[PDB]
Design a binder for these strands. Structure first.
Ligand code: GTP
Ligand code: 3AT
Ligand code: MG
Ligand code: ZN
Lengths: 422, 149, 99, 298, 50, 54, 125, 739
RNA sequence: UGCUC
């Protein structure tokens, strides 16, 4: 699936980045538009965008009821007051559409204008949903309330001068508790008053049929060459993935990933502590080919010993100085001595007898069993055999390391003969 | 429901034919067969279930309902009305029951257990009421059953 | 009760004690009947557990073979000594003078 | 036997449908003598038990059929001169189900027993066409009260007993002859017996209250006995008929079927101590203290 | 009963009249049949039928 | 059936005007006269013939 | 009306006809770029920080795949929710602090959604 | 004790009194420390759990906190001031038993095989059973007593829990809430929540013909009234509102204000409103009405027994709630004492140090863990039987009682609806293990291989959902909700948005979770019947590990198993390498799992690790359970909890009110792998006897057995019963003592 | 509460 055709280019325009709004009518299908409806005005605020459109509707059309129009006009407004009237004439002539804010940030939304062979993207400064607002009914209810008050007052023909002098009812500006103050701030009335504090801005309407529409429609384009290498937008896939997903901030607790993040020495130490038996090639494969062999060799020579070409973790690594036998509680030094004796017996011969080790080291059966299971397997009629075969390749490749390990084992043998009196 | 009835009929046919074959092939002096013949304990159905083939696991007189969406267990396809996927047990107790078959058998067992648990209390209350209501009648010497009054 | 699992456990335990092994009764698996039957016939015992047995009372052999084998029985806390109860006149409650 | 009963299922009594409550719940409903029971069954015999056409005819006669179940389409037509709801009856389905219903019978069923529409508002414009013309009744009902009739008109009955909800044609396949009967899942025995073509002499019912109210107290006793015996036999366990006879007589010795609940027990018995011990201790004790009713030791 | 750990109660009457009534009316030999349908309950059981 | 006013979007009742029946909204003077026939069928499911079980 | 696809949409918009069309596409929160000298941090990079000119290409592969090559990475473009109500894209330019102009640019009919090809980003490294 | 306690302390870090301003008590950091005993005079001493068992005391650690306050307007700081005592769970992070070797366990007189995880209070071992409840913030469509198919939603936030219902009793949708005098039509609530046009409401409910036909009656009923604006609907709601028994304070015409507050905060608390913007809440109620309409036809009624909607609360959440309640009570008491002391005492400046009672929290915790009855007035939660006495009949008894789960139903009657064994319990709970009797079906046990998830941050989940093309719900109208290809994506009961081609979304989310960028415990499921994509990240959900299968071949090979056996890798490596992943009930509902390799077909997404893990701990002892009947396995599990045998290696030093030991216990010959896993062979509870199946002497008629006299004479079945007799010689108020 | 039946 190769890009056979339609290799369209994408351009970016910043001319109307702060002047582009998206108005959508959830109740008006796309078939019918407001191109023929003469608009009158549009109130708007720069901050806390909430636009209110005031349009005009026809009356002589057959789809308009003149009697109900007169009725609603008399209900919303007075008889002939006309100082603050929602409608100039005695009929419902003006219609109000109120805007609701969908989301606070609209940076991820952009308008795309498609021309032959190119697509121009322009950011949106705000997106609002326009719906037919019912505000004339609130004023109608207020007028009905004031008319009821007027009737209650005119219950009598001649109303005597009421001695209703406004006594001084100046209330305490009581210090409001922090909880009550927060409740007041979070109240809907406070937010509405704060929104109303911002002054309104009046704007005229220019329909799509106007020449100004086609005149300003060209600003969505940008003057530029067809082929231009963008200076930005050059991060690798890994960098993009790290950007769009930023981070939040037994002895085998550490996993492989956590292991690889540690220095080479710690990696080798933990690998020898967990496995306790592994060739050199397996260690090189697990650590990775990008690591030099000399470094891995120097690291493993400090926490391992050579037995029949294989590498066995040192005794002191498994049993720290402050540790003890989990079965008998003997000090870790005796466990280290016993494990060294077992490793020496394995280096001297491939077959090791459990009874002989138990008799020489004077240790219990469970400790010798644990020492043998770490580096040996039970073979019937033969005793205990080293788990891995004789690896002569590593011996032939590194004779100096072989000699170093041989002299170290000679020293360990001298120490064991001095201790156990072999 | 027609498909359900037909599948249940086919599974019951398999069950009864396997049971008949096991009864015909079994030789005399068989302790289970003898205990089923004399009626001391057990029956031919239990023998067929434990030797030849376990029957269809029926919950409330119907196949295993779909606990998950459109299927009893995720191990079967969606909208799959196959016998093995609705409660049927092809294997016997001797050969061993598969995980799904064992789960369906445990479902049937717990259903029976809860049924008996509810029955105990319900019949206890019914017996209490019936006895408290009927404890007054008695047979007189004139062959007329009269109340306390 | 159709407790064929008990018979399988008994056969597996017999085979294990004969060959000195611990058979596994893992759910939906474990040692099959054929392996234990082979182990039984190899040691000279019957391949079905049933063995020739003589009646201890009359001293005559039984007409039917008996199914012998090692079974893991576990004793429960329910004892007759703790459940045995007998009440004489004894004490009575203060509110209602009853036992 | 209640403990011996297993409360089984799948016992459709040979019809593979019409789930009926049997077992301990059924014995409970029987002994309680409740006026309304769950899943009432009525068995009716036919005069012509060998013909299926007559069986379906009597079924349609007894079974409740709504207007929406026989009409093929209902449409609100707002003509420029007037608005009204129109209903087109499917004569084909009518003759298939063998229902003796026509446009005039539908019009007569309208305006009666429901929706209060007057006869002058309903008209017949053809062989299978009916018209309904709502008006501004002024009882919070403007012309747009259409929206009520359009929701209620489809559920107006055109034929059958309102109480009857479902009736089926059961067949007994005796080797001598295959006969037909009606199994009605309703709670109206009088209407079923009064319908044409139904042998009212051999019609039984499961609801004891209806039998008591319709055919007397002895009929109720016989129905209770038969129902208890049948419910007990369904589970394979048998009881001597004398026990159920004594139970039914004790339930029907005051002329009215009184259940075993606290209400019937109080209506039957008179001892204050027994009523206080069974249920409603304080209430019964205070009532007796008020009435000063002396209780014997009988 | 099934002899699987069930605890049963044993009562001793304290009156000669009660003793005689228990022996006569509640006698095991006199209650070999149930009053429900007259079927005998006290009969052979497993290990006796076989 | 349910219809809405293009002006405000509220439900349209049917009322008898001075010349002909018309759809009208209860919160605005918008109206719409009926010119030709308008129908809204529902097609109820009928009763089916049920069978002779047994 | 059958559910159209982006590839056929663009094909019939360019081959079957030549009239321009206004589209409304939804870009991800962060673009694969860095704010150019915007005083920073690995923050969000939106279109408000990028400059004019060619920023990416739109490829239509076989089998109906529609991708957007916006540099080293490639997103995928799919059809968004099929909106049927009126959507008018207008330009509200406040030229003066007292009087501004509202310019109806056009109508919005189709909606696109651009998403990162997470599978490619994962199998890459 | 390491995270939640710090969050609770931070939530109430500052407490101050209204009188005498500029005075405050600020908490800085709280510590629990190691377990200690207050025996010594004003001195602490390390104490082992066995010593607490012997001395009939509690095994708790001192809860201290560093604080800073103002005595006389001069800031005084305390770095270490004990405030309470928290009972420390055994084998916990701060417990002395953790990180100890069997020899060190012997030095402390504790069994190494002891499961632990139970509290020791006043010498008794109490265990907090895992509580099971219904998932919160979820719509439930169910039939009412009269057969009406209505809906319910129990919105539960960190402060309030409110259950609001919706019924169709009279063909129209009425919404019922505990704060409304009478249920009101749903259209009035729609008009009150900002959306006043009926066309928009209908589009939000649905565009299907039957949907409009069913919703017509509600529109007509609303039209009959004069409610057409938001103000009128709010006034009607306020008229349908009742004061909470004369709330203190001047109302000042708060009818409409109270209505708006109840609509914004009280009703649907889980649905958040940015600033009195009910758009999300409007869409939520519209989707609920649509679900009710769709359910009013085909009877697709959701079931409560579906464990995919169940949540398990461990001891952690219960203890967190209890500690929060106790800390709030302590802060309130301190504020009251301050208000009572500071304004009238003397020029001697008052300080909280002289009034910080340290016995409050300790006594509260002790009573809550011992009695087991939890009464939280701040949440109005009155629970009983939360803690139970650990049964020491045998090792298996305790090991099985530690993994128990109780039901919210709190068995008191015969419901017979949750008692059934649901297929949703596959791999999570043991089907056979259940107490035989009245508690059958409602007291369950966990499976051998299972895990309970915790709570996540939910941040990266929302970020990835937003970056994957999820369109904002506020940007489009509700009409898009009626399209067949548009699927709703939720998040813990909250509408996250809409999406198209949900297959891509689910695949990418699963791949990202496998990669490691998303927490492996976040579950994603899809429901095509309702067309809803559920994203669950709350804690308490049951998850099970499964091997990922791709193209008829499992990801796990023999080489990986060899590496695991040799120690090159662990289970966490399998989790990171996209080899084994955790699946939830709701997630596995859409996935295809294979029992064995031979069962793997083309349409398979996962593979079963082991089938025998379906059983629990008690059921694991059954040798060859698939060859027996289910009641047999249930009775075997019931009696195994009462089986007689050794308890541990410290059973001789242990002194309990009743203990049963076996003279010569022997390990079984036919042992299940579960026995080796739980190390039951080290502490067997039975003996292997040469049983012969036959009838003898007719003394084995019904379930009875005949024993050999010589066998019993040679030690077979010999048992030991140990009882405890405790006496106390206490000192009374007067200077006299019991001698 | 746990159980026993
Ligand atoms: N350990 C124990 N717990 C009990 C006992 N009785 C009740 N409970 C617990 O308390 C809860 C029920 O309390 P009730 O039994 O109603 O207590 P009560 O009978 O009102 O108390 P009293 O009237 O004093 O006997 C259950 O959840 C049980 O766990 C008992 O005898 N021993
Ligand atoms: N709640 C109870 N009420 C009355 N009796 C009970 C109750 N629980 C147990 N029992 C006694 O125990 C007996 C129940 O045993 P039963 O149910 O017949 O066998 P079971 O327990 O199913 O054994 P299987 O599982 O068949 O091996 C009968 C009854 O006398
Ligand atoms: Mg018993
Ligand atoms: Zn209108």
């Amino acid at each position: 699936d190769d890009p056979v055709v339609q290799e369209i280019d994408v351009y970016l325009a910043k001319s109307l980045a702060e002047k582009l709004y998206l108005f959508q009518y959830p109740v008006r299908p796309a078939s019918m538009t407001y191109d023929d409806i003469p608009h009158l005005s549009a109130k708007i605020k720069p901050k806390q965008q909430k636009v209110e459109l005031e349009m005009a509707i026809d009356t002589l059309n057959p789809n308009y009821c003149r009697s109900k129009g007169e009725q609603i006009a008399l209900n919303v407004d007075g008889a002939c007051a006309d100082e603050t009237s929602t409608y100039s004439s005695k009929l419902m002539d003006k219609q109000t559409f109120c805007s609701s804010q969908t989301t606070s940030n609209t940076s991820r939304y952009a308008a795309a204008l498609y021309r032959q062979g190119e697509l121009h993207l322009t950011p949106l400064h705000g997106i609002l949903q326009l719906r037919p607002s019912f505000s004339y009914l609130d004023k109608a209810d207020a007028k009905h309330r004031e008319r009821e008050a007027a009737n209650e007052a005119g219950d009598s023909s001649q109303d005597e001068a009421e001695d209703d002098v406004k006594q001084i009812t100046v209330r305490f500006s009581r210090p409001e508790s922090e909880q009550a103050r927060q409740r007041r701030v979070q109240s809907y009335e406070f937010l509405q008053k704060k929104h109303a504090e911002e002054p309104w801005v009046h704007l005229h309407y220019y329909g799509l049929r106007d020449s100004r529409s086609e005149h300003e429609r060209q600003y969505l384009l940008c003057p530029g060459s067809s082929g231009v290498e963008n200076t930005e937008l050059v991060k690798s896939p890994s960098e993009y993935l790290m950007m769009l997903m930023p981070p939040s901030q037994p002895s085998n607790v550490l996993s492989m990933a956590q292991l690889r993040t540690l220095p080479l020495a710690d990696q080798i130490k933990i690998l020898m502590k967990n496995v306790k038996v592994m060739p050199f090639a397996n260690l090189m494969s697990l650590l990775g080919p990008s690591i030099d062999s000399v470094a891995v060799l120097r690291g493993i020579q400090k926490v391992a010993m050579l037995v029949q070409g294989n590498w066995v973790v040192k005794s002191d690594i498994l049993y720290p100085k402050d540790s003890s036998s989990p079965h008998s509680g003997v000090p870790a030094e005796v466990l280290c001595r016993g494990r060294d004796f077992v490793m020496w017996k394995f280096t001297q011969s491939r077959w090791v007898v459990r009874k002989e080790v138990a008799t020489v080291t004077k240790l219990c059966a469970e400790d010798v069993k644990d020492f043998l299971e770490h580096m040996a397997v039970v073979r019937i009629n033969k005793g205990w055999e080293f788990i891995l075969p004789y690896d002569g390749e590593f011996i032939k490749k590194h004779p100096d390391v072989v000699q170093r390990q041989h002299m170290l084992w000679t020293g360990i043998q001298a120490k064991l003969e001095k201790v156990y009196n072999l | 429901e027609t498909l359900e009835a037909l599948i249940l009929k086919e599974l019951s046919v398999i069950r009864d034919h396997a049971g008949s074959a096991c009864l015909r092939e079994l030789d005399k002096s068989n302790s289970p067969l003898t205990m089923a013949l004399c009626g001391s304990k057990g029956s031919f159905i239990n023998i067929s279930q434990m030797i030849a083939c376990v029957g269809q696991q029926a919950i409330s007189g119907s196949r295993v309902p779909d606990g998950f969406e459109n299927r009893s267990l995720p191990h079967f396809e969606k909208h799959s009305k196959l016998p093995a996927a609705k409660g049927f047990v092809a294997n016997s107790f001797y050969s061993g029951l598969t995980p799904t078959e064992f789960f369906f058998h445990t479902m049937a067992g717990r259903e029976g257990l809860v049924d008996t648990a509810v029955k105990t209390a319900e019949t206890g209350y019914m017996q209490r009421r019936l006895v408290k209501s009927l404890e007054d009648l008695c047979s007189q010497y004139d062959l007329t059953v009269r109340s306390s009054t | 009760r159709m407790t064929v699992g008990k018979l399988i456990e008994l056969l597996a335990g017999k085979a294990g004690v004969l060959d000195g092994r611990f058979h596994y009764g893992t759910a939906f698996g474990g040692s099959k009947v054929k392996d234990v039957c082979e182990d039984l016939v190899r040691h000279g015992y019957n391949y079905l557990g049933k063995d020739y047995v003589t009646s201890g009372i009359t001293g005559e052999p039984l007409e039917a073979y008996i199914y012998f084998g090692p079974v893991y029985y576990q004793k429960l806390k329910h004892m007759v000594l703790d459940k045995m109860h007998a009440r004489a006149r004894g004490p009575r409650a203060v509110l209602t003078r009853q036992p | 036997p209640g403990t011996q009963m297993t409360l089984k299922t799948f016992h459709f009594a040979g019809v593979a449908s019409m789930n009926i409550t049997l077992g301990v719940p059924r014995i409970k409903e029987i002994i309680n003598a409740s006026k309304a029971i769950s899943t009432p069954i009525i068995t009716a015999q036919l005069d012509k038990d060998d013909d299926a056409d007559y069986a379906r005819l009597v079924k349609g006669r007894i079974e409740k059929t709504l207007l929406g179940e026989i009409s093929e389409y209902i449409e609100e037509v707002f003509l420029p001169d007037d608005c009204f709801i129109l209903v087109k009856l499917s004569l084909e389905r009518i003759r298939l189900l063998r229902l003796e219903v026509n446009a005039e019978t539908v019009r007569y069923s309208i305006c009666t027993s429901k929706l209060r529409v007057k006869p002058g508002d309903v008209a017949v414009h053809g062989e299978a066409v009916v018209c309904v013309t709502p008006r501004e009744n002024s009882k919070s009902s403007m012309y747009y009260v259409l929206q009520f009739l359009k929701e209620d008109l489809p559920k107006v009955v055109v034929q059958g007993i309102p109480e009857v909800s479902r009736a089926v044609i059961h067949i007994d396949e005796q080797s001598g002859k295959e006969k037909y009967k009606l199994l009605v899942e309703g709670d109206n025995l009088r209407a079923v017996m009064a319908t044409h073509g139904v042998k009212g002499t051999r019609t039984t019912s499961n609801n004891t209250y209806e039998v008591e109210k319709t055919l007397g107290i002895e009929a109720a006793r016989t129905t209770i006995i038969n129902e208890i015996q049948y419910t007990m036999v369904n589970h394979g366990m048998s009881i001597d008929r004398r026990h159920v006879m004594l139970l039914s007589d004790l339930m029907t010795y005051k002329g009215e079927v009184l259940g075993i609940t606290r209400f019937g027990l109080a209506k039957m018995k008179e001892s204050v101590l027994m009523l206080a011990s069974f249920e409603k201790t304080a209430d019964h004790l205070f009532d007796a203290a008020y009435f000063g009713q002396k209780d014997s030791v009988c | 009963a099934d002899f699987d750990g069930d605890e049963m109660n044993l009562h001793l009457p304290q009156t000669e009249e009660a003793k005689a009534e228990a022996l006569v009316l509640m006698g095991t030999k006199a209650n070999l049949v149930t009053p429900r349908n007259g079927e005998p309950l006290i009969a052979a059981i497993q290990d006796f039928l076989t | 059936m349910l219809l809405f006013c293009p002006g405000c979007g509220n439900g349209l009742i049917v009322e008898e005007g001075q010349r002909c029946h018309r759809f009208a909204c209860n919160t605005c003077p918008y109206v719409h006269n009926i010119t030709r026939k308008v129908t809204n069928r529902k097609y109820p499911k009928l009763k089916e013939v049920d069978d002779v079980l047994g | 009306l059958p559910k159209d696809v982006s590839v056929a949409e663009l094909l019939r918009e360019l081959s079957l006809t030549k009239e321009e069309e206004l589209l409304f596409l939804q870009l991800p929160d962060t673009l694969p770029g860095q704010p150019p000298t915007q005083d920073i941090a690995e923050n969000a990079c939106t279109l408000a920080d990028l400059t004019e000119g060619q920023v990416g290409k739109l490829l239509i592969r076989k089998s109906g795949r529609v991708q957007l090559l916006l540099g080293k990475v490639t997103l995928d473009v799919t059809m968004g929710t099929a909106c049927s109500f009126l959507q008018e894209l207008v330009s509200v330019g406040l030229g003066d602090s007292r009087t501004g102009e509202m310019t109806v640019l056009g109508h919005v009919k189709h909606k696109l959604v651009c998403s990162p090809d997470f599978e490619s980003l994962l199998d890459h490294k | 004790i390491n995270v939640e306690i710090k969050k609770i302390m931070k939530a109430n870090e500052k407490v101050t009194s209204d009188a005498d301003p500029m005075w405050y008590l600020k908490y800085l950091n709280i510590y629990v420390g190691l377990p200690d005993v207050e025996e010594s005079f004003n001195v602490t001493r390390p104490v082992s759990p066995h010593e607490c068992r012997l001395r009939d005391m509690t095994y708790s650690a001192p809860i201290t906190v560093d604080i800073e306050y103002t005595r006389g307007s001069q800031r005084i700081i305390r770095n270490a001031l004990p405030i309470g005592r928290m009972p420390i769970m055994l084998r916990s992070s701060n417990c002395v038993l953790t990180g100890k070797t069997p020899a060190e366990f012997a030095k402390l007189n504790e069994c190494p095989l002891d499961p632990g995880g139970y509290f020791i209070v006043k010498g008794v071992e109490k265990v907090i059973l895992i509580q099971e409840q219904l998932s919160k913030n979820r719509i439930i469509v169910e039939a009412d007593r009269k057969g009406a198919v209505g809906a319910s939603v129990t919105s539960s936030t960190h402060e309030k829990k409110s259950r609001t219902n919706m019924a169709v009793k009279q063909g129209r949708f009425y919404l019922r809430h505990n704060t409304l005098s009478e249920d009101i039509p749903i259209v009035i609530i729609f008009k009150a929540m900002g959306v006043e046009s009926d066309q928009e409401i209908v589009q939000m409910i649905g565009t299907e013909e039957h949907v409009m036909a069913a919703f017509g009656p509600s529109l007509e009923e609303c039209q009959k009234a004069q409610i057409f604006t938001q103000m009128q609907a709010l006034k009607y709601i306020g008229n349908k509102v009742r004061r909470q028994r004369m709330w203190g304070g001047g109302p000042k015409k708060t009818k409409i204000e109270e209505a708006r507050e109840l609509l914004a905060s009280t009703i649907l608390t889980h649905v958040p409103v940015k600033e009195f913007n009910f758009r999300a809440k409007c869409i939520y109620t519209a989707v609920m009405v649509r679900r009710v309409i769709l359910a009013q036809g085909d009877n697709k009624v959701d079931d409560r027994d579906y464990y995919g909607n169940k949540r398990l609360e461990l001891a952690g959440q219960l203890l967190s709630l209890l500690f929060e309640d106790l800390f709030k009570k302590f802060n309130s008491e301190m504020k009251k004492i301050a208000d009572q002391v500071i304004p009238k005492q003397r020029a001697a400046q008052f300080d909280v140090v002289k009034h910080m009672r340290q016995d409050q929290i300790t006594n509260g915790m002790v009573n809550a863990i011992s009695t087991g009855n939890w009464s939280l007035k701040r949440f109005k939660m009155d629970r009983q039987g939360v803690t139970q006495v650990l049964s020491r009949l045998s090792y298996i008894s305790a090991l099985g009682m530690m993994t128990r789960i109780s039901s919210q139903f709190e068995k008191t009657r015969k419901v017979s609806g949750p008692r059934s064994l649901q297929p949703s319990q596959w791999g999570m709970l043991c089907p056979s293990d259940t107490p035989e009797g009245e508690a059958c079906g409602l007291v369950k046990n966990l499976a051998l291989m299972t895990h309970i998830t915790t709570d996540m941050e939910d941040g990266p989940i929302v970020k990835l959902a937003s970056n994957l093309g999820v369109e904002d719900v506020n940007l489009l109208c509700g009409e898009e909700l009626s399209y067949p290809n548009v699927f709703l994506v939720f998040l813990n009961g909250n509408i996250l948005g809409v999406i198209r081609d949900h297959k891509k979304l689910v695949n990418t989310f699963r791949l990202m979770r496998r990669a490691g960028y998303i927490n492996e415990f976040v579950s994603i499921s899809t429901n095509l019947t309702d067309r809803c994509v559920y994203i669950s990240s709350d804690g308490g959900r049951l998850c099970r590990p499964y091997i990922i299968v791709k193209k008829q071949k499992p990801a796990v090979t023999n080489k990986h198993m060899e590496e695991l056996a040799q120690g090159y890798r662990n289970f966490e490596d399998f989790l990171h390498e996209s080899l084994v992943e955790y699946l939830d009930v709701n997630e596995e509902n859409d996935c295809n799992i294979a029992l064995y390799e031979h069962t793997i077909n083309k349409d398979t997404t996962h593979l079963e690790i082991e089938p025998f893990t379906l059983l629990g701990v008690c059921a694991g002892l059954i040798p060859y359970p698939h060859h027996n009947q289910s009641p047999r396995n249930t009775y075997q599990c019931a009696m195994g909890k009462q089986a007689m045998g050794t308890i541990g290696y410290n059973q001789r030093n242990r002194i309990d009110t009743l203990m049963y030991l076996l003279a010569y216990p022997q390990k079984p010959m036919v042992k299940t792998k579960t026995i080796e896993l739980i190390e039951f062979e080290k502490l067997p509870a039975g003996q292997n006897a040469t049983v012969a199946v036959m009838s003898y002497s007719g003394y084995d008629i019904e379930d009875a057995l005949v024993l050999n006299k010589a066998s019993l004479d040679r030690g077979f079945g010999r048992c030991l019963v140990y009882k405890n007799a405790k006496c106390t010689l206490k000192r009374y108020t007067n200077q006299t003592f019991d001698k």
